[PDB]
Amino acid sequence: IFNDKSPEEVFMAIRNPLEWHCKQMDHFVGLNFNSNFNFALVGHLLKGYRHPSPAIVARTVRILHTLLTLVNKHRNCDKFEVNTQSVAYLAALLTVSEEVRSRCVLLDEEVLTDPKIQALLLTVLATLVKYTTDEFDQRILYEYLAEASVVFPKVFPVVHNLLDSKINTLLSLCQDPNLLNPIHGIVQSVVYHEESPPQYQTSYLQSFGFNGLWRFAGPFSKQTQIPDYAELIVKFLDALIDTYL
Amino acid sequence: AHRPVEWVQAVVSRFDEQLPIKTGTHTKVSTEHNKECLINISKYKFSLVISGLTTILKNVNNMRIFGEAAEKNLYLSQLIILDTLEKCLAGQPKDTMRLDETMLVKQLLPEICHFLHTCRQHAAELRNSASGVLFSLSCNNFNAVFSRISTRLQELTVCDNVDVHDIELLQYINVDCAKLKRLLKETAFKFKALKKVAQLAVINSLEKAFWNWVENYPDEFTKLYQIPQTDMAECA
Question: Looking at chain A, which residue has its C-alpha nearest residue B5?
Fold first, then answer.
């Protein structure tokens, strides 16, 4: 069924009929698929790395693989061919996939000309490292962020808000000059520009309807938000059963 | 927002933790990169970096060191601090125009000269580092140093154990042809109504200040003998 269409093409089509109720859900969470379908799906699937059980993590990795390959094959390109869509999954799989840590450049300037997509990629890479623990993954992500900061000085100031606490803690205690070097380069570029306005800050994502990408992928809570967004979920499910049954 | 300042402050705290005075090789591999941090920061932070370094040095200068190894640790901590400051000032372009660092230079008068005020072996290394620091300062904030020298000369002319301190600073001030001519003029309209000790101190400053001018600029000296300068000749 995905031979003639992209994952967004199929999946965002059966929701359009009841997009009215679902829109409230997206606004409530901060996962506006209509803005960035692939990035919203990646943002959802990101908790897989945070799951307690080691088995669910491996599935999360497959699920991306299957998403990325399906997306790439739709444009008739290489599996690891960096593009607008493939950017998110390539970023997510980078920390785990060895064949993705080899074929990455990642921060393409000719392709990632859109400020928003670059901003989302930066935010995802930042969230993937804020809760991360792996030292090798931290080094890889830090190096990618450093390369991007040079490549994308304009947007790097917006994604630094979440990275602030982690950098401050690391810059005070962490004693890996290999890791510290990219952090130092990032700090240097941050000190360089002092012109970006609030539209080049968090509000850029927050007005792109993706404010929760820095909050969603966090640790699993304890039975708190279950009742909160259940109201839309129940209504959404009722609507889904109404139009298709 | 305004987080870059916070990071600059965090790196400053990193210096505050890597000092040999408190620590007593964890801050050997990273500290070198952690000091190259501020060294590069001075090219961009400029005044903020100078302020942080000056505060760190003044805290170093304002110390007790009651024991024995404490002075040994400080002898290295302040030496590294001075080396880093001198490197930062040398790296910083002259286009920064650090006139707003007038207060910083005033603090350095008690900080960069925290040991050379009294001027009484690590003392020699500190003196060399402070001479380099003052030389770097002269390349940008020459005006503040000359103003301090002129104020000291005016104060000492009216006035005795020693007061050539803050008046003999010309000994390490980076001299220049026009700067040397101005210094000669200022000393000329001070010399007659001056203390004999003050006159000797001015003389001692001027001889090797001229030596400094020759060494730093071995082009102006040949120019003086090539194309005559009436003002310099009259002052001489």
Answer: A191
Q: Which experimental method was this entry solved with?
A: cryo-EM
Cα dihedral angle (A66, A72, A78, A84), rounded to 10 degrees? -120
Going from the C-alpha of B222 to that of each of A68, A224, B218, B219, the distances in angstroms are 73, 83, 7, 5
- What string of DSSP letters covers B82-97? HHHHHHHHHHS-GGG-
The CA distance from A87 to B70, in Å, is 55
**Rounded Cα–Cα distance for residues B236 and B220 (Å):** 16
Helix (H) and strand (E) counts in chain A: 13, 0
- Tokens of residue A183, six digits: 């952090």
By Cβ distance, the residue of A180, A184, A191 closest to B4 is A191
Q: How far is A63 from chain B (nearest CA, A)?
A: 37
Tokens of A78: 């290489």
Give the ranges where A152-229 is alpha helix by DSSP (H): 160-173, 177-192, 203-206
Question: Tokens 């000492």 identify what position?
Answer: B156
Which residues neighbour A57 within 8 Å (Cβ) at sequence distance 6 or greater? A48, A49, A51
What residues in B contact A171, CB-CB < 8 Å? Answer: 7, 10-11, 14
d(CA B202, CA B187): 8
Cα separations in angstroms, A77 against A37, A67, A101, A119, A138: 20, 14, 19, 24, 30
Resolution (A): 3.6
C-beta atoms of A180 and B6 within 8 A = no
